[PDB]
Amino acid sequence: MTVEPFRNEPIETFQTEEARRAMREALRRVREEFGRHYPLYIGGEWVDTKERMVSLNPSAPSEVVGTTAKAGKAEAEAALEAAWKAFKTWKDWPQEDRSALLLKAAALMRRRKRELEATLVYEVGKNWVEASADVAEAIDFIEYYARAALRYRYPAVEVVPYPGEDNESFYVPLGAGVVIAPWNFPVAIFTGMIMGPVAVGNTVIAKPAEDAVVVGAKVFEIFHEAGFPPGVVNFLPGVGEEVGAYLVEHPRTRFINFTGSLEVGLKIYEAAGRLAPGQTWFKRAYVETGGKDAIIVDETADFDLAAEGVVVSAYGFQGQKCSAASRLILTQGAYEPVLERVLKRAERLSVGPAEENPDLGPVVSAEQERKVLSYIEIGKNEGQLVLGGKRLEGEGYFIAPTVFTEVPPKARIAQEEIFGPVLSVIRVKDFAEALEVANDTPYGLTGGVYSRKREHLEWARREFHVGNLYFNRKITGALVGVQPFGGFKLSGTNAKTGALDYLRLFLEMKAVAERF
Amino acid sequence: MTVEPFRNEPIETFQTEEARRAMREALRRVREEFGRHYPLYIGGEWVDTKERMVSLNPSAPSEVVGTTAKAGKAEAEAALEAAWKAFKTWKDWPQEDRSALLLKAAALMRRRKRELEATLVYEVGKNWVEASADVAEAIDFIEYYARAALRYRYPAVEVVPYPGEDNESFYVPLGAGVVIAPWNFPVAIFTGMIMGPVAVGNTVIAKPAEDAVVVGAKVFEIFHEAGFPPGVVNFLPGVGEEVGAYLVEHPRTRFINFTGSLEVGLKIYEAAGRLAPGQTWFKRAYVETGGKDAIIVDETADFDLAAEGVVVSAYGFQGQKCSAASRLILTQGAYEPVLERVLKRAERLSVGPAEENPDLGPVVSAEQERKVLSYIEIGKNEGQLVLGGKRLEGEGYFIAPTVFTEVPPKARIAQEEIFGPVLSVIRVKDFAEALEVANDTPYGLTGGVYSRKREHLEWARREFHVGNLYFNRKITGALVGVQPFGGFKLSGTNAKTGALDYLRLFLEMKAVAERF
């Protein structure tokens, strides 16, 4: 090793005056820069367009956080050209030089962390700690993938020797690919999806989510300052399906890395399976597509610990996480004690503009607000509303923490990903039934169990079919390196982020034999 | 390790009297059993059907070598039910016990090798050494995957620890999947495609190629005798697209492992990308889809060595290999010396009934004969026929070794996979142009270079874009363990057979965290 062992970046809690002072200044400076315009980034240069995209503050949507250029087909075509041109030489950088570039980018990101956190607060409505966790995870992806990439450098393939021959097997990167990123972790996941493939010699055209174009631009400012060669990373914010679909379907797109909704993920996977006219390879598509994640609590659990973990898991970042607890499955003995505790905790959660560091900021957009409120109306005819279920006062998209109980396991609110602060509570007889209910959704991303019974935990380890399973703690906030992150079933393709296995997805193997 | 280190099974050369006697005995036993009928194998039992399939001797197509049952949708459905039922417990066998089952199967196969070789001779027209190599490779896949599977047993995932927590990441098998196997290596590839997924806890429904159903049945006799639990492996010979299509498109098929034509592979990959009604996962499809493989020779080469390797590569098993040299790219200084030597060698090759151990047996079927003869007619309008290009006398599908010269790089016979004994010769100026021509096809499976110039070999190592590249030797016959086998581009998904990486394709990862 040429660098210190990987450790996770600390997540700031802002309990020191020093941290508060630094954050207040960062927020003030980001606020003072509202209205700034950020161009596209293609082939090493900032490229403007006639059309613009607007990014609003979800805590006060009359406020424009910033604008960006808007990519169309011509810009996508230019990005593809730049990315393939860059690939020709980027693929042949020694791995230590690519990894060093990543480490430089991590150092630069770390030095701008308060600024990036403040931008998340304003652009996507994260409170302070949610913002800090996001930026810390992004730094983690860079630090982790820089180190992981070294494990694939030659020699890395175990082969059986043969007499009179030299047999060499080695990995090579795939080419130029497309990243389609989500709005909910628009520093962390945006960064990881791009830097993983780039680390091992691929080039990337990245399409940020519409709601998070400004913070995506700032990440590109970092990539640019770090000195990635022209074309290695490209930034194409865009409205609607145009540029994303064009890139996914293009015969010259080698791979697609996607994190977002199941509806979109299904379309991408289907498109990736088709041979576009003139295409000369089988596209790889990595899709991470959300969840309907449950926490099971049985009567042996620490009910106070469970209630706290449930509230954190359900309502952190307003439940806008693919890992969020949206189902709470309670055995008969656990039902009253746990539900009472969850209600008492949840009813005390504050909701307000994200800059004030409330427990919950707003949901991310007017459209998200409409969807969550619509699911709340649906829930009213499926289960019993016992907390919240209302839009609060204010211009921001403020929705109260919401609980439905006695929810049928096959109810729409118990099956479909709402991605808002809406918890569905399901009552079951025992742990066996809890597992059946937990597994009976199309998804399989995260799950948790609060229980002191060792046999129930072991049972869940074997039978609770989720990619990331947690015992006696929150089910959100998977840490890079610690918990390889990715799911089963309709939660996606099990591309485990923050794990050595992630980078293998972006490599192919060549075997060369010389007979002497 | 609990067993001896892997070594490749010896390929019999039949240079001893005892080996020749043993083969003659096996040929006798096999033909005495030409009247045999082989049922389907589903859920641990041989299951017959009303309809039957006939398998013919391509060296004497009026001679029936066996009949099998014929699977339809009802049988495919029954096999899926059996495979999923088996998976429920097979997934939880300790790896050492699954691996021991494979090792038992390898020992049984080894004891029946002459019988299997003789069956290859009569059913698919392999000469003696081609048959021996095939069976040896099958045994290799079993021995190799049994050992490789251990590398994925817990603990196998490197994770970063976190204070106060136990973090466990481990692999689990996917479920029940489908294998669609080729006729050209119907012991080796049939066996490896099934045994890889099975070794790590998946269950498999296998559809043998129509032309090789009898030998597929004999492999299943070995699986049955070895004692794989009911439903773990299933055998569904079938006519046409019915059974394969049904299985590929089924919402409860977890993965598809395919080796065969590009036409079929493209359809399978597209179908795998679709969500069938009620499907609850993203299907994995591994496809290996052929090649248009070239050998480059420059003026520094050992011309005699090159000519021998070219003839072996082009005409071994009548050119019916995804790895076969179908293009010979000669620099100007190499052109006459190499072409003269190739023509002199090739014109001396014997063609006849496979059991007589000729250099070439027949092509596999009337349909293959029609395809190859059609390409010869196409070739006559594109290049210059200088050797062969004819059907020889006999009921058997005997086609002479064929050479076309002055073939334009973009000609159909220089681009499309003929899968017959047809070599296209292309004259180029120099090594740089040789590489340009080598790369300008939609494929990227195998390639070779005969050259003594070290800088040309390194150039090819970097620039000759094929998954399996060979210097100064034949480009066919990749050995399990030694040369991970699989290609780039439209040669498929780079699923490297006979390599540790192969098994990872049939696993997903779960991460379980306990906070104490």
PDB file of N, CA, C and O in Angstrom, chain A residues 448-467:
ATOM      1  N   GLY A 448     -34.604  -4.722   8.202  1.00  0.00           N
ATOM      2  CA  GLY A 448     -34.036  -4.800   9.533  1.00  0.00           C
ATOM      3  C   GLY A 448     -34.839  -5.681  10.465  1.00  0.00           C
ATOM      4  O   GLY A 448     -36.017  -5.967  10.220  1.00  0.00           O
ATOM      5  N   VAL A 449     -34.185  -6.121  11.536  1.00  0.00           N
ATOM      6  CA  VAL A 449     -34.849  -6.858  12.594  1.00  0.00           C
ATOM      7  C   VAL A 449     -34.372  -6.319  13.923  1.00  0.00           C
ATOM      8  O   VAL A 449     -33.167  -6.267  14.177  1.00  0.00           O
ATOM      9  N   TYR A 450     -35.316  -5.895  14.758  1.00  0.00           N
ATOM     10  CA  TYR A 450     -35.021  -5.658  16.162  1.00  0.00           C
ATOM     11  C   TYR A 450     -35.511  -6.849  16.962  1.00  0.00           C
ATOM     12  O   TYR A 450     -36.706  -7.159  16.977  1.00  0.00           O
ATOM     13  N   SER A 451     -34.570  -7.521  17.612  1.00  0.00           N
ATOM     14  CA  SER A 451     -34.850  -8.725  18.385  1.00  0.00           C
ATOM     15  C   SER A 451     -33.632  -9.040  19.239  1.00  0.00           C
ATOM     16  O   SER A 451     -32.503  -8.820  18.803  1.00  0.00           O
ATOM     17  N   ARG A 452     -33.864  -9.557  20.441  1.00  0.00           N
ATOM     18  CA  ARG A 452     -32.777 -10.074  21.268  1.00  0.00           C
ATOM     19  C   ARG A 452     -32.636 -11.581  21.113  1.00  0.00           C
ATOM     20  O   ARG A 452     -31.692 -12.180  21.640  1.00  0.00           O
ATOM     21  N   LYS A 453     -33.578 -12.209  20.412  1.00  0.00           N
ATOM     22  CA  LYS A 453     -33.546 -13.664  20.273  1.00  0.00           C
ATOM     23  C   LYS A 453     -32.589 -14.086  19.164  1.00  0.00           C
ATOM     24  O   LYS A 453     -32.828 -13.812  17.982  1.00  0.00           O
ATOM     25  N   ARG A 454     -31.496 -14.747  19.550  1.00  0.00           N
ATOM     26  CA  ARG A 454     -30.425 -15.061  18.615  1.00  0.00           C
ATOM     27  C   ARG A 454     -30.946 -15.918  17.468  1.00  0.00           C
ATOM     28  O   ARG A 454     -30.529 -15.746  16.319  1.00  0.00           O
ATOM     29  N   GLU A 455     -31.874 -16.816  17.786  1.00  0.00           N
ATOM     30  CA  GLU A 455     -32.411 -17.737  16.783  1.00  0.00           C
ATOM     31  C   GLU A 455     -33.249 -17.010  15.729  1.00  0.00           C
ATOM     32  O   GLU A 455     -33.297 -17.424  14.570  1.00  0.00           O
ATOM     33  N   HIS A 456     -33.911 -15.933  16.135  1.00  0.00           N
ATOM     34  CA  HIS A 456     -34.682 -15.131  15.188  1.00  0.00           C
ATOM     35  C   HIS A 456     -33.746 -14.362  14.270  1.00  0.00           C
ATOM     36  O   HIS A 456     -34.002 -14.240  13.074  1.00  0.00           O
ATOM     37  N   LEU A 457     -32.657 -13.837  14.824  1.00  0.00           N
ATOM     38  CA  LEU A 457     -31.671 -13.155  13.994  1.00  0.00           C
ATOM     39  C   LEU A 457     -31.056 -14.109  12.969  1.00  0.00           C
ATOM     40  O   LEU A 457     -30.882 -13.753  11.799  1.00  0.00           O
ATOM     41  N   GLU A 458     -30.724 -15.321  13.404  1.00  0.00           N
ATOM     42  CA  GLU A 458     -30.134 -16.308  12.508  1.00  0.00           C
ATOM     43  C   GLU A 458     -31.130 -16.700  11.412  1.00  0.00           C
ATOM     44  O   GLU A 458     -30.771 -16.848  10.238  1.00  0.00           O
ATOM     45  N   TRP A 459     -32.383 -16.857  11.813  1.00  0.00           N
ATOM     46  CA  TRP A 459     -33.494 -17.117  10.906  1.00  0.00           C
ATOM     47  C   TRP A 459     -33.560 -16.024   9.828  1.00  0.00           C
ATOM     48  O   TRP A 459     -33.603 -16.311   8.632  1.00  0.00           O
ATOM     49  N   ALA A 460     -33.551 -14.767  10.257  1.00  0.00           N
ATOM     50  CA  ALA A 460     -33.580 -13.647   9.318  1.00  0.00           C
ATOM     51  C   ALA A 460     -32.357 -13.631   8.400  1.00  0.00           C
ATOM     52  O   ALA A 460     -32.470 -13.333   7.209  1.00  0.00           O
ATOM     53  N   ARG A 461     -31.189 -13.950   8.957  1.00  0.00           N
ATOM     54  CA  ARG A 461     -29.950 -13.973   8.183  1.00  0.00           C
ATOM     55  C   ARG A 461     -30.100 -14.881   6.967  1.00  0.00           C
ATOM     56  O   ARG A 461     -29.609 -14.562   5.880  1.00  0.00           O
ATOM     57  N   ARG A 462     -30.813 -15.988   7.160  1.00  0.00           N
ATOM     58  CA  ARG A 462     -31.035 -16.982   6.114  1.00  0.00           C
ATOM     59  C   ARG A 462     -32.240 -16.668   5.223  1.00  0.00           C
ATOM     60  O   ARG A 462     -32.200 -16.922   4.017  1.00  0.00           O
ATOM     61  N   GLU A 463     -33.302 -16.116   5.811  1.00  0.00           N
ATOM     62  CA  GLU A 463     -34.610 -16.073   5.141  1.00  0.00           C
ATOM     63  C   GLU A 463     -35.135 -14.695   4.737  1.00  0.00           C
ATOM     64  O   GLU A 463     -36.028 -14.608   3.895  1.00  0.00           O
ATOM     65  N   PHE A 464     -34.622 -13.630   5.351  1.00  0.00           N
ATOM     66  CA  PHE A 464     -35.118 -12.285   5.068  1.00  0.00           C
ATOM     67  C   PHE A 464     -34.379 -11.869   3.801  1.00  0.00           C
ATOM     68  O   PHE A 464     -33.202 -11.510   3.853  1.00  0.00           O
ATOM     69  N   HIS A 465     -35.062 -11.945   2.662  1.00  0.00           N
ATOM     70  CA  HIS A 465     -34.376 -11.853   1.371  1.00  0.00           C
ATOM     71  C   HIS A 465     -34.158 -10.417   0.889  1.00  0.00           C
ATOM     72  O   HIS A 465     -34.865  -9.913   0.001  1.00  0.00           O
ATOM     73  N   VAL A 466     -33.165  -9.767   1.491  1.00  0.00           N
ATOM     74  CA  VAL A 466     -32.766  -8.413   1.113  1.00  0.00           C
ATOM     75  C   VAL A 466     -31.253  -8.387   0.977  1.00  0.00           C
ATOM     76  O   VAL A 466     -30.558  -9.161   1.637  1.00  0.00           O
ATOM     77  N   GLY A 467     -30.743  -7.506   0.121  1.00  0.00           N
ATOM     78  CA  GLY A 467     -29.311  -7.395  -0.087  1.00  0.00           C
ATOM     79  C   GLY A 467     -28.540  -6.796   1.069  1.00  0.00           C
ATOM     80  O   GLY A 467     -27.339  -7.054   1.219  1.00  0.00           O
TER      81      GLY A 467
END
